[PDB]
Swiss-Prot record:
Gene: EAPA
Keywords: Aspartyl protease, Disulfide bond, Hydrolase, Protease, Signal, Zymogen
Organism this protein belongs to: Cryphonectria parasitica (Chestnut blight fungus)
Family classification: Belongs to the peptidase A1 family.
Annotated S-S bridges: C255-C290
Positions in coiled-coil regions: none
Domain Peptidase A1 residue range list: 17-328
Residues of the full protein shown: 90 to 419 of 419
Domain of life: Eukaryota
Protein name: Endothiapepsin
Class of enzymatic activity (EC top level): hydrolase
């Protein structure tokens, strides 16, 4: 089997991407944030505290003839941005782009933190990291990809995120028309539950490539590119007037600037992030200070190849017995 679904930016900055997902019988379509940095499929629901719902579409398990309470199961998750959610668990039929999994754990939110309530465009998350990170207790549950894997034509999914435009998540096949050149594959460590890999270095603009190992994660659920402070300083030093602002929470730059590109290494190959992808717009409405798309990871504990980096590439998440990642230009 295969599946193919379009993923669409939630706003003009590409802050996140939503993909329609069918849950239950008859289908209830929710727009979920596909997140290769976590491993829970959770949704706003008829059980979510009413004051914490503000415009999201909800899953109502009582209206699904295939929903079953997973008795005794609870979940609770906290994300790197400080947000969180928790609740109980149903199993139900879940389909993405024509690919159907029966018996998928659908985690129903009883509580969500304010940033989820405040974002009316995201109805939940669909985790695509390794199932060892799934938070369901006392019986850990499998991701949608883990459940689908054996049925797929090939045990892979791909992320093709757009810049200010829709893109595609495919399951079970590699669309050879969706990228240019060849796909370069690189080793993955699953020891932390992430799609963790080592970039071979970087360049700023037209500058020379610096060969240096940068361990980090491919995370579609994180907006920006988080890298070591040395690398980030070298980037922003090429932008007149750019500075790190403690009050804003990162590097800012004059909105009048033209930003240089940023290149990262994948083995001997190179992925170029155009400068425009690094512009996240005014820090507040009407400001001439703009927020940067490359930020320091120093306070995180891990480097994160988020959407800023991934949307410059066609990315293969290879879930073979020994997983690997592939990157191609596009």
């Amino acid at each position: 089997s295969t599946g193919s679904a379009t993923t669409t930016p939630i706003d003009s900055l590409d802050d996140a991407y939503i993909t329609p997902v069918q849950i239950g019988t008859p289908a209830q379509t929710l727009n979920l944030d596909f997140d290769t940095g976590s491993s829970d499929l959770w949704v706003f629901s008829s059980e979510t505290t009413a004051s914490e719902v503000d415009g999201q579409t909800i899953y109502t398990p009582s209206k699904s003839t295939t929903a079953k309470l997973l008795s005794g199961a609870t979940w609770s998750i906290s994300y790197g941005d400080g947000s969180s959610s928790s609740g109980d668990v149903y199993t139900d039929t879940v389909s993405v782009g024509g690919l159907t999994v029966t018996g998928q754990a659908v985690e129903s939110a009883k509580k969500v933190s304010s940033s989820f309530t405040e974002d009316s465009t995201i109805d939940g998350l669909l985790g695509l990291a390794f199932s060892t990170l799934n938070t369901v207790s006392p019986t850990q549950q499998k991701t949608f990809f883990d459940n689908a894997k054996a049925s797929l034509d090939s045990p892979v999914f791909t992320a093709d995120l757009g810049y200010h435009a829709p893109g595609t998540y495919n399951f079970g096949f590699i669309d050879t028309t969706a990228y240019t050149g060849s796909i370069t594959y690189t080793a993955v460590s699953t020891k932390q539950g992430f799609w963790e890999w080592t970039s071979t270095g970087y360049a700023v603009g037209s500058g020379t490539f610096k060969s240096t190992s940068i361990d980090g994660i491919a995370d579609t659920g994180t907006t920006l590119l988080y890298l070591p402070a040395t690398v980030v300083s070298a980037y922003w030093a090429q932008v007149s007037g750019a500075k790190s602002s403690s009050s804003v929470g990162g590097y800012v730059f004059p909105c009048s600037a033209t930003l240089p590109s940023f290149t990262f290494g994948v083995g001997s190959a190179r992925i170029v992030i155009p400068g425009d992808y690094i512009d996240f717009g005014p820090i507040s409405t009407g400001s001439s200070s703009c927020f940067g798309g490359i930020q320091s990871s120093a306070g995180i504990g891990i480097n994160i190849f988020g959407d800023v980096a991934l949307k410059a590439a066609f990315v293969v998440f290879n879930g073979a017995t020994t997983p690997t990642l592939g990157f191609a230009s596009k």
